[PDB]
Amino acid sequence: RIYKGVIQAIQKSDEGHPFRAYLESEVAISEELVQKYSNSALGHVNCTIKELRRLFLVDD
């Protein structure tokens, strides 16, 4: 069920338009926030950052 949505996604943005980059950037930049949750978890901060980045993840 659309499990390979990594090579296709990067493709679309590559097909649709280049301007998408600057867009996907903010999306890929957020992917890091999810990584900060691990270091933020130190004090349930992940839910604080996630809620800021994702706005739903809230830790997980």
UniProtKB/Swiss-Prot annotation:
Stretches assigned to the Lumenal side: 1-60
Listed under subunit, the entry gives: Binds to RTN4R. Interacts with ATL1. Interacts with TMEM170A. Interacts with RTN4IP1.
Q: Please give the residue positions where the record annotates the modification N6-acetyllysine.
A: 50
Described function: Required to induce the formation and stabilization of endoplasmic reticulum (ER) tubules. They regulate membrane morphogenesis in the ER by promoting tubular ER production. They influence nuclear envelope expansion, nuclear pore complex formation and proper localization of inner nuclear membrane proteins. However each isoform have specific functions mainly depending on their tissue expression specificities.
Name assigned to this protein: Reticulon-4
Q: Which tissues does it occur in?
A: Isoform A: is specifically expressed in brain and testis and weakly in heart and skeletal muscle. Isoform B: widely expressed except for the liver. Highly expressed in endothelial cells and vascular smooth muscle cells, including blood vessels and mesenteric arteries. Isoform C: is expressed in brain, skeletal muscle and adipocytes. Isoform D is testis-specific.
State which stretch of the full-length protein is shown.
Answer: 1055 to 1114 of 1192
Disulfides per UniProt: none
What does the entry's domain section say? Three regions, residues 59-172, 544-725 and the loop 66 amino acids, between the two transmembrane domains, known as Nogo-66 loop, appear to be responsible for the inhibitory effect on neurite outgrowth and the spreading of neurons. This Nogo-66 loop also mediates the binding of RTN4 to its receptor.
